[PDB]
Design an enzyme around this catalytic site. Structure first.
Site, PDB file in Angstrom:
ATOM      1  N   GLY A 242       4.190  -5.641  -2.926  1.00 16.47           N
ATOM      2  CA  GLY A 242       4.235  -4.603  -1.773  1.00 16.47           C
ATOM      3  C   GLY A 242       2.692  -4.539  -1.478  1.00 16.47           C
TER       4      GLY A 242
ATOM      5  N   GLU B 259       1.857  -7.482   1.141  1.00 15.61           N
ATOM      6  CA  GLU B 259       2.556  -7.174   2.572  1.00 15.61           C
ATOM      7  C   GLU B 259       1.826  -5.816   3.132  1.00 15.61           C
ATOM      8  OE1 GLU B 259       6.644  -6.638   1.939  1.00 15.61           O
ATOM      9  OE2 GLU B 259       7.022  -8.819   1.328  1.00 15.61           O
TER      10      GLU B 259
ATOM     11  N   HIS C  66       2.369 -15.499  -9.883  1.00 12.32           N
ATOM     12  CA  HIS C  66       1.722 -14.110 -10.277  1.00 12.32           C
ATOM     13  C   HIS C  66       1.470 -14.957 -11.919  1.00 12.32           C
ATOM     14  CE1 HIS C  66       2.093  -9.545 -11.046  1.00 12.32           C
ATOM     15  NE2 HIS C  66       0.984 -10.093 -11.185  1.00 12.32           N
TER      16      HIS C  66
ATOM     17  N   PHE D 181       5.254  -4.461  -7.157  1.00 10.45           N
ATOM     18  CA  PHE D 181       4.095  -3.930  -6.532  1.00 10.45           C
ATOM     19  C   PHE D 181       2.912  -4.725  -6.077  1.00 10.45           C
ATOM     20  CE2 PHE D 181       5.541  -0.103  -9.683  1.00 10.45           C
ATOM     21  CZ  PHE D 181       5.999   0.698  -8.336  1.00 10.45           C
ATOM     22  N   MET D 182       2.947  -5.872  -6.580  1.00  4.05           N
ATOM     23  CA  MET D 182       1.854  -7.102  -6.014  1.00  4.05           C
ATOM     24  C   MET D 182       2.308  -7.619  -4.721  1.00  4.05           C
ATOM     25  SD  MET D 182       0.301 -10.490  -7.491  1.00  4.05           S
ATOM     26  CE  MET D 182       1.845 -11.266  -7.416  1.00  4.05           C
TER      27      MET D 182
ATOM     28  N   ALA E 135       3.231  -4.441 -11.651  1.00  2.00           N
ATOM     29  CA  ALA E 135       4.386  -5.184 -11.583  1.00  2.00           C
ATOM     30  C   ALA E 135       4.414  -6.314 -10.499  1.00  2.00           C
ATOM     31  CB  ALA E 135       5.633  -4.169 -11.208  1.00  2.00           C
ATOM     32  N   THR E 136       5.147  -7.219 -10.680  1.00  2.00           N
ATOM     33  CA  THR E 136       5.216  -8.260  -9.537  1.00  2.00           C
ATOM     34  C   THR E 136       5.646  -7.560  -8.117  1.00  2.00           C
ATOM     35  OG1 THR E 136       5.734 -10.228 -11.015  1.00  2.00           O
ATOM     36  CG2 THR E 136       6.179 -10.646  -8.673  1.00  2.00           C
TER      37      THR E 136
END
Lengths: 133, 133
Positions: free
Chosen positions: A43, A46, A72, A40-41, A37-38
């Site tokens: 996260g 960061e 993304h 999670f990407m 998921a965007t």
């Protein structure tokens, strides 16, 4: 911490970082394709910058992400390794900025910038308590 | 779809949307304040736009987030309601561009832009399956 310094972070994408796992409450996301998921990407990007700046923190300090500006550009199924590269762009007092980019070993999957703010953990936690129902 | 139309989406933040729950595998995130993670706010923004778009897609279509560019300027503990407002800026072929913002009942928590692309779900799923190792 030097401006222009790169820090890299590797993460094998497991089945539970796909879209439907970010929001299991979402009937829209329930039957979405099994891709990283965007959010999670975000996260993961960061997380890379948190690890990059850990040496900058004083006792009692932590950090918050205050902006994320990324594309993304390709999809990643579980099993591939996403590598995030975080290049430090600015550090001034409480404010830190990076260029981030990610690649899943096959495609570049997105890139842009992330900003963070150094915080006093206990003062911040008191502020959050005051708006907690 | 009409440009300039505003759609809202409300969501009571549960305990399992704080930073530590975004990456349970990250020891760095496990010590963060119990506040709504930026990766989760991103997913909530995408969800608002997915909901907005749903009546305008043909059967078997969905969409992908292709860019997110937002601030995240105030923190939100579990139990507050986050309302996302999404407003359509333009539609060009398969590409939809949005202005998004979110507020937790107390503060404006972030704003900026988000872009999406319309996809054919089955075809995209087959392509994704084919880069699966």
């Amino acid at each position: 911490m030097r401006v222009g310094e790169r820090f890299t972070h590797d993460f094998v994408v497991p089945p539970h970082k796909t879209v439907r796992h970010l929001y299991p409450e979402s009937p829209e996301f329930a039957e979405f394709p099994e891709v990283f998921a965007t959010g999670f990407m975000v996260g993961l990007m960061e997380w890379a910058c948190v690890r990059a700046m850990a040496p900058y923190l004083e006792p009692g300090e932590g950090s918050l992400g205050t902006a994320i500006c990324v594309t993304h550009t390709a999809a990643t199924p579980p099993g591939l390794t996403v590598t995030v590269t975080a290049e430090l762009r600015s550090v001034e007092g409480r404010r830190l900025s990076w260029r981030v980019s990610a690649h899943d070993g096959v495609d570049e999957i997105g890139s842009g910038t992330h900003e963070r703010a150094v915080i006093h953990l206990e003062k911040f936690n008191a502020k959050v308590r005051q708006k907690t129902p």
